[PDB]
Amino acid sequence: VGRLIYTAGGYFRQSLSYLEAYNPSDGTWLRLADLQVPRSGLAGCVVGGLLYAVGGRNNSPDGNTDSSALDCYNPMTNQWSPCAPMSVPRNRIGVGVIDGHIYAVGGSHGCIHHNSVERYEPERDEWHLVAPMLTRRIGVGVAVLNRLLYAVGGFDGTNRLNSAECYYPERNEWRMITAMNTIRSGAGVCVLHNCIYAAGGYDGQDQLNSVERYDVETETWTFVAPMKHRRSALGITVHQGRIYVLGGYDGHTFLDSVECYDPDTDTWSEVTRMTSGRSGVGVAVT
Ligand SMILES: COc1ccc(S(=O)(=O)N(CC(N)=O)c2ccc(N(CC(N)=O)S(=O)(=O)c3ccc(N)cc3)c3ccccc23)cc1
Numbered sequence: 001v002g003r004l005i006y007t008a009g010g011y012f013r014q015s016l017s018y019l020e021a022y023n024p025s026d027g028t029w030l031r032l033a034d035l036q037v038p039r040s041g042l043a044g045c046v047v048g049g050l051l052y053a054v055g056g057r058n059n060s061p062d063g064n065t066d067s068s069a070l071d072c073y074n075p076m077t078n079q080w081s082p083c084a085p086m087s088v089p090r091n092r093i094g095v096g097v098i099d100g101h102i103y104a105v106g107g108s109h110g111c112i113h114h115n116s117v118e119r120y121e122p123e124r125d126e127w128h129l130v131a132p133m134l135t136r137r138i139g140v141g142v143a144v145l146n147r148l149l150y151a152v153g154g155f156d157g158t159n160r161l162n163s164a165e166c167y168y169p170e171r172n173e174w175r176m177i178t179a180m181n182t183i184r185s186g187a188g189v190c191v192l193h194n195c196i197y198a199a200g201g202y203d204g205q206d207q208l209n210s211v212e213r214y215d216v217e218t219e220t221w222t223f224v225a226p227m228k229h230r231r232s233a234l235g236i237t238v239h240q241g242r243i244y245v246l247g248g249y250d251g252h253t254f255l256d257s258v259e260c261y262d263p264d265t266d267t268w269s270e271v272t273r274m275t276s277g278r279s280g281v282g283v284a285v286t
Contacts, residue, residue, distance in 0.1 A: 010278030011040035015059030044282030055093035094142035106137035113157035141189025153184035188236030235283035249279040
């Protein structure tokens with residue numbers, strides 16, 4: 001009877017179709033309607049209390065194909081419903097919500113490394129392209145803060161990135177903001193109390209466990225306590241003023257651990273474990 005952390009899809013051995021939700025007050029997991037097609041490297045977001053699944057890579061009998069798909073899940077009806085697909089496929093995608101619109105940002109088609117972002121209008125059920133990013137980004141993290149969209153880290157097709165750019169919908173243009181002190185692709189990026197948090201990811205050498213935040217007051221990146229477990233391609237969300245990071249890859253095993261970050265005490269604790277270790281999930285809280 002509360003807001004829940006949903007995790008859709010993921011990977012373990014092959015692409016996953018699970019939808020599950022976690023209740024933080026009683027620490028319990030719920031099993032909900034599976035995705036109609038299994039996907040990993042998708043992103044999740046919530047608009048108008050609906051759960052949208054964006055992008056990822058399909059796994060199917062035809063083959064493993066990068067997805068263009070947008071699908072919408074209603075917690076009241078426990079039902080998945082297809083919507084209009086994006087202009088292009090996008091694996092390793094990031095998404096953010098501004099003014100009840102979904103921004104699909106970056107991602108990979110084959111090895112087209114996208115730098116185009118498109119915006120979906122739920123009422124109209126339409127996707128319309130907007131200004132493309134300055135940089136090509138896949139495995140990119142996205143965050144919205146004061147109606148400004150941030151794309152953080154990723155891989156441009158040749159380099160792993162520590163830059164981050166910020167989108168002013170007002171002007172429909174992108175500007176580069178201060179780079180992170182760490183190169184992160186596949187990171188977890190969320191907003192919490194006027195900070196963007198980039199957590200884990202891959203710097204090109206090893207999977208990361210460090211966490212840094214961009215304080216927009218200072219437009220500079222600080223380090224904070226690190227996670228207990230290295231993890232790349234994690235899912236991240238914020239719930240009741242704490243950060244949650246779910247699963248991911250450590251270079252060795254597919255994590256099932258869920259860690260919770262208290263900004264007040266600047267510490268991480270492991271609050272639970274998922275039912276199955278996985279990575280590349282989409283996460284949203286409604
Ligand atoms: C073989 O073992 C597996 C390890 C992970 C998975 S996955 O389910 O999580 N998955 C599914 C997909 N490709 O769609 C993904 C894989 C790699 C990514 N990165 C590349 C990027 N950002 O471009 S990475 O930086 O995080 C990274 C780099 C190197 C290593 N060794 C590990 C991770 C992803 C980034 C965002 C979302 C998903 C990603 C499946 C098998």
